[PDB]
Amino acid sequence: GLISARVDSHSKILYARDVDQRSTTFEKSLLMGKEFQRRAKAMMLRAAVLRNQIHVKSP
């Protein structure tokens, strides 16, 4: 839900958590780049197999 906080069960205190935008955006952008590269490689292989006409026949 809407609470953005972290509990401390030693002293029993709830601390508000402030998220820095810079690190979060850097992390998400790098993850998106990794996913994009993986998808591009996979579809390059898919294009190769489609061009070469590889498929599974009944026998």
Element (H, E) at 16: strand 13-16
Q: Which residue has tokens 């489609």?
A: 50
List phi, psi (to 5°) of 28: -65, -40
Q: Which residues in the 19-58 window bind another protein by CB under 8 A? A: 21-26, 28-30, 32-52, 54-58
Tell the smallest beta-carbon distance from residue 2 to another protein (Å).
14
Tell the smallest beta-carbon distance from residue 49 to another protein (Å).
6
Which chain residues interact with another protein by CB under 8 A? 6-10, 13, 15-16, 21-26, 28-30, 32-52, 54-58
